[PDB]
Amino acid sequence: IQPKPTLWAEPDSVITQGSPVTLSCQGSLEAQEYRLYREKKSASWITRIRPELVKNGQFHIPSITWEHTGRYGCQYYSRARWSELSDPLVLVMTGAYPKPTLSAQPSPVVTSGGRVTLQCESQVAFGGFILCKEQCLNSQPHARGSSRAIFSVGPVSPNRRWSHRCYGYDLNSPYVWSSPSDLLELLVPGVSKKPSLSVQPGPVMAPGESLTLQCVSDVGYDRFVLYKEGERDLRQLPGRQPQAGLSQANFTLGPVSRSYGGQYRCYGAHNLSSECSAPSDPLDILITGQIRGTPFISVQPGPTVASGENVTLLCQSWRQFHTFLLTKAGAADAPLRLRSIHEYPKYQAEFPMSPVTSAHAGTYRCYGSLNSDPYLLSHPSEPLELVVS
């Protein structure tokens, strides 16, 4: 019969260094002898594999190194005939270099039908990069070597998981790759039933303090995803249903710094598919003490309030502010924001309290902000407590 043999790797043709791999040649049942060849460059010796290692067609590699990588092809002897060369197998090793960083230009979440741009970046200089989905595709083979390469994947498929992972390799050894980049998840949102976002203690945070988020949806979405407009990577956490009929997730970000301020959006999805829920109503996170100046607050007519009275707050400042903010003590919900008013020689903003209720009582603080970056607030105002009776 003498069919063309098949050459295949177990558990995969991509193996981290040191980890074991086993190849296998598959010919006829008349298989007497097994030849197995290597190849690493279009000019190398051939590097044929010795028969002391080809045991019943299975060439076992206990500890893979950057010697074993290359193109393999097997060929067996049967009926006084050497078989044809099997389809070549490319054995590739990973984990030799530090792992690069994969990112999505410009959006890590794209609407259904658009092709997103990806890029892997690294400090060290590599010859070329590889993008594998979890079918690998590389960049053009460069000669000098860049620090980052650009890929263009698309269009999107809502039924499949658009997970990606990036490698880097040297030009003189295109079969010896770097360590695996962090698993990047792409995402395609859509209808329906956008979840609800809530924050603790409040959307206005001070440095050093940490905040914990909560994304809730009555529909039983499996995992929840949250990201920032402008931010180029995502964060995923599988959501559970501790309550009867409501899925939730406690996104606990660490100590808050300047970089954490921004507009955050959450939306859910199911595990196996990538057809995700509609984006929830956005929640803005604001950081204090990140810009100069500190305003102080006053009242009118006084901090004693009777139910059925018109009271007005106001914050003054000497430094230029474009918008002012009013935050109530826990729990703060909106919080309020009105643009400034240049009442020489100060910048003020009246926060009216048009006819009051019993809920307008509590401790109130004020913040100043600019339009250079609206998510960065000034130092807090002196706390002004208000009582009602």
Q: Say which CATH number the domain at 334 has.
A: 2.60.40.10
DSSP sequence for 80-127: TEEPPPPPPEEEEEE-SS---EEEEES-SS--TTPPEEEEEEEEEEES
For residue 180, CA distances in Å to 61, 65, 136, 165, 326 come to 21, 17, 13, 7, 47
Q: Quick check: 30 and 78 in contact, CB under 8 A? A: yes
Residue the block writes with tokens 């990606």? 164
Here the tokens at position 280 are 């929830």
Whether 244 is in a domain gets the answer yes
Regarding whether 172 and 197 lie in a shared domain, the answer is no
Regarding whether 330 and 240 lie in a shared domain, the answer is no
Burial of 330 by CB count in 10 Å (0-12 exposed, 13-18 middle, 19+ buried)? exposed
Regarding whether 277 and 339 lie in a shared domain, the answer is no
Whether 279 is in a domain gets the answer yes
Select from 188, 206, 228 the last residue of a domain: 188
Q: Which residue pairs from 40-43 have beta carbons closer than 8 angstroms and sit at least 24 positions apart in sequence?
A: 40/69, 40/70, 40/71, 40/173, 40/175
Whether 199 is in a domain gets the answer yes
Select from 48, 69, 95 the last residue of a domain: 95
- How many independent structural domains does the chain possess? 4
Please give the residue range of the domain that contains residue 177: 96-188
What determination technique applies here? X-ray
CA–CA distance, 169 with 126 (Å, rounded to integer): 6
In 3D, which of 288, 296, 291 has the Cα closest to residue 383?
296
Regarding whether 79 and 10 lie in a shared domain, the answer is yes
Q: For residue 70, give every residue at least 6 positions away whose Cβ sits within 8 Å of its Cβ, in sequence order, or none.
A: 38, 39, 40, 47, 90, 91, 175
Regarding whether 212 and 276 lie in a shared domain, the answer is yes
Select from 287, 314, 330 the last residue of a domain: 287
